[PDB]
Design a protein around this ligand. Sequence first.
Ligand SMILES: O=S(=O)(Nc1cc(-c2ccccc2)cnc1Cl)c1ccccc1
Length: 862
Amino acid sequence: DRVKKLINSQISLLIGKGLHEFDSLRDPEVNDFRTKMRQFCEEAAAHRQQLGWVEWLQYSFPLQLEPSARNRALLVNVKFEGSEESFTFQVSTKDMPLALMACALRKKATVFRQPLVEQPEEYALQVNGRHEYLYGNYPLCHFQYICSCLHSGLTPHLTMVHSSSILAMRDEQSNPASLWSLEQPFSIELIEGRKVNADERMKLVVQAGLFHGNEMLCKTVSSSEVNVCSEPVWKQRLEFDISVCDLPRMARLCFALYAVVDCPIAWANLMLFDYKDQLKTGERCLYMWPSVLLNPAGTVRGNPNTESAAALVIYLPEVAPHPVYFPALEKILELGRHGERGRITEEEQLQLREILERGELYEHEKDLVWKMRHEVQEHFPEALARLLLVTKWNKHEDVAQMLYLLCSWPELPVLSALELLDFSFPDCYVGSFAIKSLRKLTDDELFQYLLQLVQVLKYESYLDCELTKFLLGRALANRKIGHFLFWHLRSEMHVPSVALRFGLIMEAYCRGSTHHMKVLMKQGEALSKLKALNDFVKVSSQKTTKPQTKEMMHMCMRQETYMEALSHLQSPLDPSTLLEEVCVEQCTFMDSKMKPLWIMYSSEEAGSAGNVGIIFKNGDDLRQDMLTLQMIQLMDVLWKQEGLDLRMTPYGCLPTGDRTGLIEVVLHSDTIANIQLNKSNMAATAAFNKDALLNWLKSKNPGEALDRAIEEFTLSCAGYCVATYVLGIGDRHSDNIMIRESGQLFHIDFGHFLGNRERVPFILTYDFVHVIQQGKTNNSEKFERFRGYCERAYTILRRHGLLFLHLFALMRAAGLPELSCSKDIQYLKDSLALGKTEEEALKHFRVKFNEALRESWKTKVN
Ligand SMILES: O=S(=O)(Nc1cc(-c2ccccc2)cnc1Cl)c1ccccc1
């Protein structure tokens, strides 16, 4: 009672929408989702509270392993929980956590003078001051943390945590106690319009279309030209060239209101069948969306702003004296079960094999694929997507035959399934099949494609769908998936077209984890304080000097409310990272337009690893930066899987709200511009500006350490050269290129990509060529090693080109201005040269790299 009320108020606060607003809609679809998903999520919670302690570690602290894992001597520091005493010992990189734990237990038994009761099977290793653990049958070098410690030269710091301490964690965090006979053409009545705004010199026209995804089910139909006014009256029948029996389940009726002398005013879409498969009848008031002509990919829910929105009043006629439902799967299978099998020649079989292993088709090739659909199922099951595109979705008998084959179709690889989630495959059985083939995704693969799967939610026609249930069950079984599902949904609550669906998904999730809701509320409280702090800085910076604005910012941070809200939270960029004590004296802001905040933290328990920073940005849209950074991280994963480590810096970037988000601070790094300022009285002051970077690296890496710093520079430079080329990242200058003290180079501020439209050439800078060449004019041994790294990295990506295309195609749903149409994805097809052999593509890359070298020489000549 009292606790249910508190939880409801806490969910309302967290999701940024009062739960009463869901009830105020008196919508049965909203109500059924809330009830079904509350039940499904609470069952997930009860399953969790009973997990074994190692399974609970898999839930809460999923393993962070090196892509390769999916000899060498090592020093490790181990302490036991609650002890100020630690033990430093030598293990091998090939040793398993259990060997290290048994070594720590022998040390404790000798130091505490007792033959211990505890066995190493009773413990897990926590990374000090982090929500990260090392457990399982994996050598130590396979863990991201150990791998990171080895490369940086730092000593791993671990805590032996007993099964009883993990079980106390689990307990503390528990939840509190018949259509086919209807042959008449499809038709509607266009009654009237309301709240219409347009030039009175013009006329109003309503264009109407019937769609199955992106494809027209028949020709579009227009109303008559009526004079422009606030309340236009049509009262006319619009008839389509499609029988009511041929309407597919996922048929959408799309509208566009416009003014003619073309002038787009608004658009609205609706599904012809409801969420309970009933064919819609009666009057419908369609609260239209402003047009930026038909928009089939647009949401099928009305504009919530009923006070200002233009509205179309339509009538769906009563086609039968009884409710008509879409036929059940059993009746569809019955109809599709019958149909002649393909009996063709070996030559016509060779023409079919040529096109199925090939990508648009000619009409005769379509009729052949459809004829040979049984052979597609039995010998080319990965060509399901081609066959689905040749199916005539506007003929219920052809759809029945396709659906019969699909229900016996073998499970497809993850790559094929991601393609099948595209809006070009709108059928709910195709969608269900795609999800079934994605269930085999590992948590690491799911995490990698989470952003795209969340965007796919904007294509969903109904609230209760297989994709939401899949995403919810996977989020409730893995805290890190849960974390990022919440934030991707939360960051779009200011968008009216998704606020309902997203708010309901977050409510359902919260029912499944009360503790995690409170952890996320703490993150929201910090973000709330950061926004108020940033507004103060924006105002102050325009009136006083930077050291004055910085002092006032510190004073505001020093307030009890800010110190409490800003300290002891999980990072929204990484729930493994704990943001403990805010280091006020170290906090600052950037001189740029939006004045982003630089917030520093420290943790005594994590030591050096607890020294972390976050950038809070308000005023810019960070979605494209996040997508680019995720794509670079995917490149890094793919290269490491072929044994190529290009020493990339895929730092965190997370939109959290309306033009609001966080960026991970990469410590011990500076921009090329600051280094190239060539300031006097510094360790890097150069005779020639070209020496500055190398002198800076020399000062950070004394003696023998320079060699490895030049090598890290070369590797990351090859990785970023390929990544910016493939992704079309332009506007690259000295202030958006950074360098780490280790020698690693990385890119920041990714506002423009995919050539944005001017095709971006491969980029080579003489300042970077100089470091690669170890400060020598001619050093083709070092330069050509660099070109080899570029070529190897490029050819690895091309081999996974389809994965990038499928993910970028899913991202079209994001609404990013630079990722709107097929032209934007043409850029990625061209940069990866996928319509070529590896020989023709490598030849082409060599032409572009040599062209970039000749361009770079225009700077070398001087
Ligand atoms: O305004 S900023 O603070 N935004 C930003 C900073 C970083 C960043 C990340 C890891 C270390 C360091 C800076 C990444 N992306 C962006 Cl858009 C910035 C700082 C320095 C140069 C230019 C822009």
